[PDB]
Amino acid sequence: HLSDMLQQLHSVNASKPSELVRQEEAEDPACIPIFWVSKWVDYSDKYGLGYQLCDNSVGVLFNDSTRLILYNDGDSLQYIERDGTESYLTVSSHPNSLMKKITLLKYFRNYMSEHLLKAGANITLPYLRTWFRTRSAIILHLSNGSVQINFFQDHTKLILCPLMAAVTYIDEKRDFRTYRLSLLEEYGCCKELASRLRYARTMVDKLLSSR
């Protein structure tokens, strides 16, 4: 879905949306995402990157390029090998071979729950495919095609959903608005969002170039 996201971003950016801007008319409540990353912890110098999704499921992308996901029921597990092969297990019944990884996941889970703010908390299955950080942002690519970009300095966030051709923007006051990209082309948007969308295009290009 990355190339579709790139085309959607090309189209909106080429329309020069910030140049009468009628940004409010580009909002679409029907396009609100189901999943996004609400918390994350970068322990990649030792273990990997842990994260919580907005449904309270947690996942780790380990340094050996495997993934373990704990469902929000707190017992059901999905393990994804490097090849991409999925296995389904539980904490109550797992092979000894995954003990190390499960214990690491539980520690990440407990820490995030206790210590980090839940992004998009005021709003009512995929795993982390890859991620990277720049000086400005962390970029999270989910297995359902969604791409999330969290900007460090001002705490603003984009969630890009190529299947809906939509983008959710969480601003500095933590207001959460979801826009149809084609409506941003039609009605325009503020310079702030337009700038973030230009950055997003460059980030999606990075994902595509490092496949």
Partner 1 sequence: VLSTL
Q: Residues in the site for partner 1, rule: CB under 8 A?
A: 39-42, 115-117, 119, 133, 150, 155
In whole angstroms, the minimum distance from the beta carbon of 188 to partner 1 comes to 30
In whole angstroms, the minimum distance from the beta carbon of 167 to partner 1 comes to 20
| Of residues 79 and 176, the one with the C-beta less far from partner 1 | 176
In whole angstroms, the minimum distance from the beta carbon of 94 to partner 1 comes to 28
Q: Following CA atoms 157, 172, 48, 37 in sequence, which dihedral angle do they give, to the nearest 10 degrees?
A: -50
Give the DSSP letter of residue 24: G
Q: Following CA atoms 70, 108, 133, 180 in sequence, which dihedral angle do they give, to the nearest 10 degrees?
A: 40
Q: Which two tokens stand for residue 31?
A: 């396009």
| Of residues 8 and 146, the one with the C-beta less far from partner 1 | 146
In whole angstroms, the minimum distance from the beta carbon of 187 to partner 1 comes to 31
| Of residues 31 and 41, the one with the C-beta less far from partner 1 | 41
Task: Give DSSP secondary structure letters for 47-60.
Answer: TEEEEEETTS-EEE
| Of residues 28 and 171, the one with the C-beta less far from partner 1 | 171
Task: Provide the β-strand partners of residue 61.
Answer: 49, 67
